[PDB]
């Protein structure tokens, strides 16, 4: 799954951490609902069953240290500009422990 994560490793991570890797795999910008539909599919669930996790994901992602929204609906991964990885999987979910 995605780079090297099997389903159990994905299901244990925050939806935003999945979203980083999904985007690091994608390297393209995705609308919220469509990205969510891919997340839904990664987890093997219906997006409606996520209930609380929807609002959580939205709140988490929208104030996240990763992601940048392009026009409005779409979100894009930040790695396509300088910071600590320029489109390279050199980081693999950048928790960035200190430096």
Swiss-Prot record:
GO MF terms held by the record: DNA-directed RNA polymerase activity
UniProt KW keywords: DNA-directed RNA polymerase, Nucleotidyltransferase, Transcription, Transferase
A GO CC annotation given for this chain: DNA-directed RNA polymerase complex
Gene knockout outcome: No visible phenotype; grows as well as wild-type at 25-49 degrees Celsius, no apparent impairment in sporulation or phage SP01 growth.
HTH HARE-type domain: residues covered: 13-80
GO biological process: DNA-templated transcription; regulation of DNA-templated transcription
Role description: Participates in both the initiation and recycling phases of transcription. In the presence of the delta subunit, RNAP displays an increased specificity of transcription, a decreased affinity for nucleic acids, and an increased efficiency of RNA synthesis because of enhanced recycling. May function in sigma factor switching. It displaces RNA bound to RNA polymerase in a binary complex.
Subunit structure: RNAP is composed of a core of 2 alpha, a beta and a beta' subunit. The core is associated with a delta subunit, and at least one of epsilon or omega. When a sigma factor is associated with the core the holoenzyme is formed, which can initiate transcription.
Recorded family membership: Belongs to the RpoE family.
Protein name listed in UniProt: DNA-directed RNA polymerase subunit delta
Native organism: Bacillus subtilis (strain 168)
Residues of the full protein shown: 2 to 92 of 173
């Amino acid at each position: 799954g995605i780079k090297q994560y099997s389903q159990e490793e994905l299901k244990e991570m925050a939806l935003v951490e999945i979203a980083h890797e999904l985007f690091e795999e994608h390297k393209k910008p995705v609308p919220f609902q469509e990205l969510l539909n891919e997340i839904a599919s990664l987890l093997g669930v219906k997006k409606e069953e996520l209930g609380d996790r929807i609002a959580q994901f939205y709140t988490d992602l929208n104030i996240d240290g990763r992601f940048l929204a392009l026009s409005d609906q779409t979100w894009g991964l930040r790695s396509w500009y300088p910071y600590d990885q320029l489109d390279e999987e050199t980081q693999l979910e950048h928790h960035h422990h200190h430096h």
